[PDB]
């Protein structure tokens, strides 16, 4: 159905995302259990890590387009990522390595992420009808890899330990690299302009130097989240000032703030919703016992099933509005499950968390899948930078919000933790509902501005 390089890119993306989500699914539990962080420390540290992973995505598109070429930067990103996963596995012998190892993953992700999609765009003549379907299959590739990793990595970490889990993340990257190298002949005439000139060693060294610098800066920021907060605060107010100085951009700004709220909520899946499943949900569904950390896999699960359907099935601001209503309902469902449908021992049915994740995933499919594509329809490089800055800020804010559900390690009674989750999730849902209503009200004016 698709060009031959499509299948190469599909499987490279699948394996890279498997490595990444293998780490993400276990990281907060690893912080708590292996490093002895309180839940509060673990949540803010995950927030900082996630902020760096997402804010640095801006670098790899520039490196691939203008310095080294898309294909070279795919290889380099994959190699830096694999090194990061093996360093994380090594951090169990050498605990002091952990932050450097996470910085290496963040920077590796930054170099890699934009480039396969860019590559995929170049596999099709410019107005090929199959493009939409190919990109929906690309998103499904991401979520198949994520589904496998979030399902299996907690089980593997429980049975064989974290070193094995992280080494298998690294191995997934190695095999992404092997399938790329094996399929290299399929993309010989596919690439950005630097891909076809001999590699500039000057620029390669600049990229390696900057990467190493960034790895150390990332390590420091994750170790000292209290200064990452002000770094992003002052960057945010400053770039806000310079955005205001310089009206389709105003629409881009309001959609950016709405996206920020969405990402604050999305950030709860590996933290507060993860520990809610651990502490206050039954660990049994359809008669099978499961690791509750695996409940995170319900997000890619619902995306994999729902992306074709919704591909089969207003315009921009209303799709954003719908996503915000879905997210609101996910958190109100969580609160309701805890407030009214718990057992006398304080435990709730996992079908409520299945429903929570359905809502949240529909929110993802309406918003983040369809955001910067027509933020690119309203617009440049400055707004991309501000975009990535705001989404990083959203993840830091999300770690902070998650700390309101943090449970001290000595608590053992689910009836003590359930009202904490329900209060926070109910308030998140109410605030998000209010935000969704104000977006609804702004939909017509916004839709005029888009003209």
């Amino acid at each position, epitope marked *: 159905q698709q060009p031959r390089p499509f299948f190469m890119i599909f499987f490279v993306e699948l394996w890279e995302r498997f490595g990444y989500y293998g780490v993400q699914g276990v990281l907060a539990v690893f912080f708590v259990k292996q490093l002895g962080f309180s839940q509060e420390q673990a949540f803010v540290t995950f927030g900082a890590f996630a902020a760096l992973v997402y804010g640095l995505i801006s670098i790899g598109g520039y490196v691939g387009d203008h310095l080294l070429g898309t294909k070279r930067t795919i290889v380099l990103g994959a190699l830096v990522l694999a090194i990061g996963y093996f360093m994380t596995g090594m951090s169990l012998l050498k605990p002091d390595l952990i932050f450097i190892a996470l910085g290496t993953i963040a920077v590796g992700n930054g170099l890699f992420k934009a480039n396969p999609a860019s590559l995929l765009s170049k596999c099709y003549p410019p107005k090929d009808p199959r493009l939409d379907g190919a990109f929906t299959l690309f998103y499904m590739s991401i979520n198949i890899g994520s589904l496998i990793a979030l399902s299996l990595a907690p089980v593997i970490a429980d*049975r064989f330990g974290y070193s094995v889990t992280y080494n298998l993340c690294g191995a997934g990257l190695i095999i992404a690299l092997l399938v790329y190298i094996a399929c290299r002949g399929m993309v010989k005439d596919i690439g950005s302009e630097p891909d076809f000139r001999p590699m500039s060693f000057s620029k390669l060294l600049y990229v390696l130097l900057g990467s190493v610098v960034m790895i150390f800066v990332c390590a420091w920021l994750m170790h000292n989240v209290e200064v990452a907060n002000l770094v992003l605060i002052v960057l945010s107010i400053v770039v806000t000032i310079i955005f205001f100085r310089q009206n389709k951009m105003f629409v881009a700004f309001v959609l950016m703030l709405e996206a920020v709220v969405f990402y604050i909520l999305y950030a709860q899946m590996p933290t507060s919703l993860n520990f809610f499943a651990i502490n206050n949900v039954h660990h049994e569904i359809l008669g099978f016992s499961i690791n509750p950390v695996s409940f995170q896999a319900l997000n890619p699960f619902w995306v994999v099933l729902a992306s074709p359907i919704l591909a089969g099935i207003l315009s921009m601001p209303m799709k954003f509005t719908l996503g915000m209503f879905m997210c609101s309902l996910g958190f109100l469902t969580a609160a309701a499950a805890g407030m009214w449908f718990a057992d006398a021992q304080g435990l709730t049915s996992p079908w409520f968390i299945v429903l929570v994740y359905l809502f949240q995933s529909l929110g993802e499919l309406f918003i983040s899948a369809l955001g910067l594509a027509m933020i690119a329809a309203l617009v440049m490089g400055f707004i991309l930078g501000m975009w990535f800055l705001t989404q990083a800020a959203a993840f830091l804010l999300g770690g902070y919000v998650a700390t309101f559900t943090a449970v001290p390690d000595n608590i053992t009674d689910p009836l003590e933790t359930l009202p904490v989750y329900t209060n926070v999730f109910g308030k998140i849902g109410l605030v998000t509902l209010g935000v969704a209503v104000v977006m609804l009200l702004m939909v017509p004016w916004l839709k005029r501005m888009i003209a």
Partner: nanobody
Framework: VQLVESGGGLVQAGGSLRLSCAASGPTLSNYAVGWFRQAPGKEREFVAGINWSSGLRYKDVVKGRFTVSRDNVKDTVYLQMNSLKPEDTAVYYC?????????????????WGQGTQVTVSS
């Protein structure tokens, strides 16, 4: 996922016994381990437990007499039972639930030992 209990037996009132729980494939370190007991003609009831990060929970009638503790090198959980009384006679079970919570009812725990008889004679 399968726990092996050891250390039950017969003892006189005022004596002591220690039960131990070990898991096979999964490291017990990630699990809250609760001890339940079933006396003749009644339901399994929560006795005592330790979560994955040293938090403790106890039934009122065993406080000041039973101690739950954990040896994370040997991957084992212990119930040290002192000042035993006839009404402590029961089959004792260890149960394991992933994480930090020790729910009071058997349905909160997925993994179960086979049970060890404890008898306390007057």
């Amino acid at each position: 996922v399968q726990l092996v209990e050891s250390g039950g037996g017969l003892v006189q009132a005022g004596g002591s016994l220690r039960l131990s729980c070990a898991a096979s494939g999964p490291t017990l370190s990630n699990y809250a381990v609760g001890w339940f007991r079933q006396a003749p003609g009644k339901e399994r009831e929560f006795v005592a437990g330790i979560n994955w990060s040293s938090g403790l929970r106890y039934k009122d009638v065993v406080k000041g007499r039973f101690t739950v503790s954990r040896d994370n090198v040997k991957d084992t959980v212990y119930l040290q039972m002192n000042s035993l009384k006839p009404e402590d006679t029961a089959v004792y079970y260890c149960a394991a639930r992933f994480g930090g919570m020790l729910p009071l009812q058997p349905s909160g725990y997925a993994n179960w030992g086979q049970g060890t008889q404890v008898t306390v004679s007057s």
